[PDB]
């Protein structure tokens, strides 16, 4: 099975989750009335994952995200040279929703991506709540960490074959209910991305967090079941 | 196993999606104060699916879409010949169910199909929250895409055996979750004649975009699918 | 494995079902601007049978339910002659939910049986939305046939074992995202019953409907897959 | 396979438990016209035990909980010895994660612990709708005791292999469907100790009611398992 499509599979995969849990964000959780607001946001993003796990994490692994193919790296479960292609991948899927997004979100007037937000990750004043960049740190860096502590966890040699895509896309829904308020949910730099460069200003000038913080809990996580839990 | 199950299984399958996945729209999607909204709905489009695709799944292969049959032929899992009696099947089964439900509907006064919709997709005028033609076309083809794209990838051979409904059902809700406000959730050319046929209005005028889009939308997830991401 | 425990199984299950499908009704559905509303409560209807027929269903077949029991004698899978003590078990098991809830419910002021309809199932003036009877009889006998069209297609010989729990318990959260604001949801004579003895006015009254109807089309229901889809 | 990870795992997974279920209640439940209520942070409950009991069930058992731990030895299927480590295990990941919650909380102004509560579980003046220290008992010792009724039916001899997760961490959530008004939601010692020293106040002079109840429903539903139902 040649290495192009693991790329094609992690390419539609990411570009599924960024058009699917950013698009619920800007179409419908604010929605007059009857709206899914961030309950709804944070389903559909577990559910891109749990879908997108079952379609092709038989081809890829499925990751869907650089912080989870480097966490997958530090926890000695995917190799070093590997890595690269997918967080290319993984971005590049990612951009590709956001425009198809963005000009869908535009056929609706009122729309402006730049006061909206669109979906973009901050943290202080771009915080959907208003928390501390070290609230954000945190929050990030827990759930980055839980998050592949999961991943690690539930494709474990031990663990029940083929329920990790239950376990993780909802894993996800999870830290979403959780971290909307905080970080507008990211643990995903790929998907901060896609979504930073259509906003194109202060989602810009942070996105750096984003890359940084969710990578090191990925590896964080990584090495807590690597050394600790697994053997 | 003789056909005419296939047919039994796709018609009730499709009615079942058609009564669960409207009925919720139609009587609690807005029930004052108490209702299930956007996000009740888009679960309920969901649940019809993982249900009837656990309960005759092992029958037909439990399509309950014209555009998957279709979609499915394009992916070389389905064989040419027997795609025209599903989406018959398919359609015939929507219908009864946009009746016996109609009919329901009918119990409370206030009720107006024609006023309200009765659930019946549409885009520009139509579209739930105003969007244009070419978002709806967008939405449409993108969500139609990945559908089949998720149907074929959860069906893989390699794929873990069983969980497709889950896999399944789930991505219903999710594309549920995005497209409600912008074709109030198609992906599904039987379903929006099913009640377009009770709209009797726009409704009928607008039919055709949702099975153009859609079926053309699960031929290029089939060979995206097929050709890409397969062997 | 002696005939006793299926009754245990059967009567812990139901009180399960009425103590959660229920009590999230009464307790939470409407609690002030945090309340679960018809979605919550749907979905606790769902849970109760998917968790408890994961726990019991491999002792009892986990039916919580007379329109089961009967309706799956309709469908050739149960026998006759141990109907009668899954119906009863069934009702035994509600009514002590009901109390013990009843109980719990009475320790916040306000509480009046009576007056709130104590999640009692009724039609017309008795609907949660204003249903005729004849739309509440039409949305019974549709979703009760279903739910056991769901239940047969499930548990059939080739369909995948064990996934059958998650496909039943979120069928009756569907139908609960479908069925609460007609009847209040039931298609559960022991469940009715539960409670209707605890709000001991016109939901006493009414019961015998959801007796005849939910019976019948769980019969329907059992009928439908026996003849027409197995085999 | 040494005890320290067990212990490490069942740590883990309870803080993740305690930071998901009650960050939930604490950052999302109650934000501005988008938060997630009730519903979504009895959700989110579940997803957090669903989650870690698929991530490291198959290493420690999966309890993340006191009277999960205890009422498993009373149904005769964990050791006496090995009960106070994990409850110890359990007490301690669950405190950390109140701080770092705590503190996370701490970066958005208006935040106070005392006043707001902090998710600790009340009764009486301190349930979050006004409920009867009785009805606070009945609950609690109702849905302790089905809780583990579940855990034990799921994990049965008998009971298809691998669901269990799924059965278990949904039974959570409906628990917290169901419990929230009355408790704020408990059954987990563990959990209303993490929150109760942090709130400090009242939280903590009620502690004791949410060890005792739900231990002793505990060993209620593990004797009720195991005598009754198992063999
Ligand atoms: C190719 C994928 C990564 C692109 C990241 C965008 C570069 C981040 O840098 C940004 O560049 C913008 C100019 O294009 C400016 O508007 C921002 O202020 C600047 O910070
Ligand atoms: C594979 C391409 C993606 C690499 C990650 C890009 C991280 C962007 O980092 C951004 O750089 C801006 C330019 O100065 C800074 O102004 C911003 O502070 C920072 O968010
Ligand atoms: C994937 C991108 C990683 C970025 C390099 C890590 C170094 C962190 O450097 C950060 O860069 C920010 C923006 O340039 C500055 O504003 C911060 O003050 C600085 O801490
Ligand atoms: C048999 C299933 C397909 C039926 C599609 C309905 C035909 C669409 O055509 C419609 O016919 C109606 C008259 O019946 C008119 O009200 C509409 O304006 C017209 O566009
Ligand atoms: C198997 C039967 C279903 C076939 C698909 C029917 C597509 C209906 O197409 C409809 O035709 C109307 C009649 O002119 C047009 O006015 C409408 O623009 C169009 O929506
Ligand atoms: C399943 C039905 C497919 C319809 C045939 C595809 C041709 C698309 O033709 C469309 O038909 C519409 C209604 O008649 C016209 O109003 C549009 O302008 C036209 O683009
Ligand atoms: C034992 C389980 C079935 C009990 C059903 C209750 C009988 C229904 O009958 C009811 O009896 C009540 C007197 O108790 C009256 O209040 C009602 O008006 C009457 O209709
Ligand atoms: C196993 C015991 C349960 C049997 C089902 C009880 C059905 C109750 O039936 C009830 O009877 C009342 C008494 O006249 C009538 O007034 C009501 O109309 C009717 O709802
Ligand atoms: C499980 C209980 C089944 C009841 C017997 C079925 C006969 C239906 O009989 C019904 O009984 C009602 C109440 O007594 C009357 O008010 C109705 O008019 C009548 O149709
Ligand atoms: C080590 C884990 C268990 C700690 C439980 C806290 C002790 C409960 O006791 C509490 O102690 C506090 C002083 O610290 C006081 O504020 C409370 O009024 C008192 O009741
Ligand atoms: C492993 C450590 C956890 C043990 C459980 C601690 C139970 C705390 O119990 C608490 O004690 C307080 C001190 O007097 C009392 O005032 C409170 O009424 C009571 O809630
Ligand atoms: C895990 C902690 C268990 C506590 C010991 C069980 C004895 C119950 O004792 C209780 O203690 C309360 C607080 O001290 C008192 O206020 C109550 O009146 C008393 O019933």
């Not at 946001?41 to 650089?66: D, E, R, Y």
């Not at 979100?105 to 006061?115: I, L």
């Not at 949910?185 to 930073?196: E, G, I, L, Q, Y």
């Amino acid at each position: 099975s040649h290495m192009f499509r693991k790329l094609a599979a992690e390419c539609f995969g990411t570009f599924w989750l960024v058009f699917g849990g950013c698009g619920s964000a800007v179409l419908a959780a604010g929605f007059p009335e009857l709206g899914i607001g961030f309950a709804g946001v944070a389903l559909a993003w577990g559910l891109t994952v749990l879908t997108m796990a079952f379609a092709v994490g038989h081809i890829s692994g499925g990751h869907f995200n650089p912080a989870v193919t480097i966490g997958l790296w530090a926890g000695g479960r995917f190799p070093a040279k590997e890595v690269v292609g997918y967080v290319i991948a993984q971005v590049v899927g990612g951009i590709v929703a956001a425009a198809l997004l963005y000009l869908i979100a535009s056929g609706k007037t009122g729309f402006d991506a730049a006061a909206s937000g669109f979906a973009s990750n901050g943290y202080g004043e771009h915080s959907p709540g208003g928390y501390s960049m070290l609230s954000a740190l945190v929050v990030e860096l827990v759930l980055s960490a839980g998050f592949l502590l999961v991943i690690h966890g539930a494709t474990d040699k031990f663990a029940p074959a083929g329920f990790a895509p239950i376990a993780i896309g909802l894993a996800l829904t999870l830290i979403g209910l959780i971290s909307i308020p905080v970080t507008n949910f990211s643990v995903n730099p790929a998907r901060s991305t896609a979504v930073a460069i259509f906003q194109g200003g202060w989602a810009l000038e942070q996105l750096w967090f984003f890359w940084v913080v969710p990578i090191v809990g990925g590896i964080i996580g990584g090495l807590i079941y690597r050394t600790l839990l697994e053997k």
